[PDB]
Ligand binder design. Structure first.
Ligand SMILES: Nc1ncnc2c1ncn2[C@@H]1O[C@H](COP(=O)(O)OP(=O)(O)O)[C@@H](O)[C@H]1O
Ligand SMILES: Nc1ncnc2c1ncn2[C@@H]1O[C@H](COP(=O)(O)OP(=O)(O)O)[C@@H](O)[C@H]1O
Ligand SMILES: [Mg+2]
Ligand SMILES: [Mg+2]
Lengths: 39, 375, 375
């Protein structure tokens, strides 16, 4: 049970890291789009 | 693994080695430029007797191995580390010998003659290579950019090069190198974090905070105003979770770390900031082409992966230069690998296959004559 | 007791608090930086109900009181110990209240902002003090040295600071602190004595061996040669008489204890030795003044009371730097108190009486603004 729990937690950490990276990239992209529209 | 007799493009950039075969769009073997050496002596029996770790094998173990940087500011300190990193890249990742295909290496602008002669000698005498070629990084980066005009700003890990090229024309007299880059930024962040309260004095933590910077640290759009609004922080300060689990809290320091680039006085050096040095370089060029250099400036180097550099450059140049013309700054996507990409597209031309240097002519001429032939 | 309205110079150095009135040449109240806390609970009736010992009162009884260090590496761990040591120094030795004279405190270079704001707040809000001032130790030590040029090496108990000052000018960029000092040397001597055969694991014995080191341990002029000649010992090994009476026999370990400073690898840290770090700092300075830094290097800190440091520094620097110039190292007598002495001569100037920070401006501005005003 503990082994499966640790595996699931590792996969969850990987997925959450990917999601947070994508969110950061998305907010930066929104800022860049706003700047480009102003220009 | 490879069925085409084409040169192996191995960009040995400071901080990250990027090796791969010509024709590819990205390096397959990407690993930091570090060498881990066994600190203590173990009475244990069975472990690898290998006395010199390299690459990911060293990254996986940074607590036992004392870490040494194989390159500092640009000047090669230890040549054993050089032989280690090439021998490793050849007989551990690529799984190919250098005796079957050429090798297009990329070196930094304005490097010592000893460095060039040494690497060429290790690549000819020791290893049996049919042909070698040294290339400046700025030209290949401008190639990958898909243009012939502009000033390339290559910010590696320990050196920063500003190279102006207008109409494909190099300017060896204006290339000015300054040893301000990621290592001095890591040192500044480390000393200011020691000022915050979390004190460390070992290299493993230094690499960890370097990674933290690469992931989080960004450039500020207005330094003093962000300082004022961060005095009372709310969303300006962020709580990062260390890979070990310790809860670190970092606020304004982020956007004050790269600011040292714009204010070298923080490290007590009379040198001017990267933007002011680039501006001075533009005055050193001719007036006729200055507008084109303003409109075609290109960036290179891993340090440029931070968010907010383009806007900061635009405001600083607009404040320094007139605001009558148009000063557009272009940063191609995945600029860091672009240099390497250039290498690939440079190794497929037949003419470039005719501009290599074979062993025999080098042996008779000697290394110094080879330096004259290249430039 | 005091008829002159002058600031009380209280050097709260790591390991030893040195307090005294301005104008004096040596601190009158010198006591270690330790706090003894009652470990058990006694059913006895009549003893002092005091729940927090300090200074000599704790030194006199180290078997009953668990000893805690109020300062670690530089960062203040517990503030109750801070309030205890100042309240004790004020209302048990000096016999004077802080409401009648200023107070010139001395803090270590590159300390956290929390430490400074905390001490300033305890010195303004809680205690009614007309004016406070924080000062770096290196400047006052250079004052007491009677010069304006050189690199001060201050080795306290848990931190070591290298501070270059040429022609009376500070260089906040180059100051690099490293937490290698007397505590890590005491730990190394303790583990090697445990290796010898006499094993202990309590703090009282740790302080005893610290005193033994202060009295006997010296620096070697040639490590490997002394190792070889000590293999067959005769006069190289000495028999010390513990204050309790147990006959201890210590041979080479003495001159191998401070050697850990020159070889941090003994404690498994990638940091460089004090001499190599100082040398690197000299390269970080400009070339023009490097010779002057070689000719005016100054030392500070209690750890420098060992015999043989000057010669070891001279040989190591001569081996590292060229041997063409002249590299004289100057160590003023009674250097440990020199810092405090500086404080005294710094508190008598009328201009310095004009550079104090009164309560009202601090209260309106707040502590953070006070940090900006000082630097
Ligand atoms: N993904 C990234 N994000 C932020 N900074 C990076 C990244 N990759 C590398 N760097 C920084 O770039 C420097 C190394 O750049 P380098 O690999 O020499 O660039 P190039 O290969 O284009 O010359 C290091 O100081 C590192 O901190
Ligand atoms: N008389 C002495 N002999 C040898 N070492 C000493 C002596 N006095 C203090 N030390 C060492 O110096 C350290 C404390 O130095 P410190 O009092 O902070 O110097 P300073 O007051 O100049 O900053 C301790 O680790 C202690 O072992
Ligand atoms: Mg680069
Ligand atoms: Mg000291």
């Amino acid at each position: 049970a503990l082994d499966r729990a640790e595996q699931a937690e590792a996969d969850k950490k990987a997925a959450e890291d990917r999601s947070k990276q994508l969110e950061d990239e998305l907010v930066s992209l929104q800022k860049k789009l706003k700047g480009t529209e102003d220009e | 693994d490879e069925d085409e007799t084409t040169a192996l493009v191995c960009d040995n950039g400071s901080g990250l080695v990027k090796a791969g075969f010509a024709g590819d769009d990205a390096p397959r073997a990407v690993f930091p430029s570090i060498v881990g050496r066994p600190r203590h002596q173990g009475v244990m029996v069975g472990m690898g007797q290998k006395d010199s770790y390299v690459g990911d094998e060293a990254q996986s173990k940074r607590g036992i191995l004392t870490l040494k940087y194989p390159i500092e500011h640009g000047i090669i300190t230890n040549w054993d580390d050089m032989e280690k990193i090439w021998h490793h890249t050849f007989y551990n990742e690529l799984r190919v010998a250098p005796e079957e295909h050429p090798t297009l290496l990329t070196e930094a602008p304005l490097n010592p003659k000893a460095n060039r002669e040494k690497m060429t000698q290790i690549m000819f005498e020791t290893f049996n290579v049919p042909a070698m070629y040294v290339a400046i990084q700025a030209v290949l980066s401008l190639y990958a950019s898909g243009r012939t005009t502009g000033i390339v700003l290559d910010s590696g890990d320990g050196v920063t090069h500003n190279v102006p090229i207008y109409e494909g024309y190099a300017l060896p007299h204006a290339i000015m190198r300054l040893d301000l880059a990621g290592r001095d930024l890591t040192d500044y962040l480390m000393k200011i974090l020691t000022e915050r309260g979390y004190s460390f004095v070992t290299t493993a933590e230094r690499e960890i905070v370097r990674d933290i910077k690469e992931k989080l640290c960004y450039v500020a759009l207005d330094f003093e105003n962000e300082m004022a609004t961060a005095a009372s922080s709310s969303s300006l300060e962020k709580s990062y979770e260390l890979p070990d689990g310790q809860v670190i809290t970092i606020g304004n320091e982020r956007f004050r770390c790269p600011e040292t680039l714009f204010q070298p006085s923080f490290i007590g050096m009379e040198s001017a900031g990267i933007h002011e040095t680039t501006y001075n370089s533009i005055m050193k060029c001719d007036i006729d082409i200055r507008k084109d250099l303003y409109a075609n400036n290109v960036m290179s180097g891993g340090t440029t992966m931070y968010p907010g550099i383009a806007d900061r450059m635009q405001k600083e140049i607009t404040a320094l230069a007139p605001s009558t013309m148009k000063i557009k700054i272009i940063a191609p996507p995945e600029r860091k690998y672009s240099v390497w990409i250039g290498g690939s597209i440079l190794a497929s031309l037949s003419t470039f296959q005719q501009m290599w240097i074979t062993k025999q002519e080098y042996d008779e001429a000697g290394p110094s004559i080879v330096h004259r032939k290249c430039f």
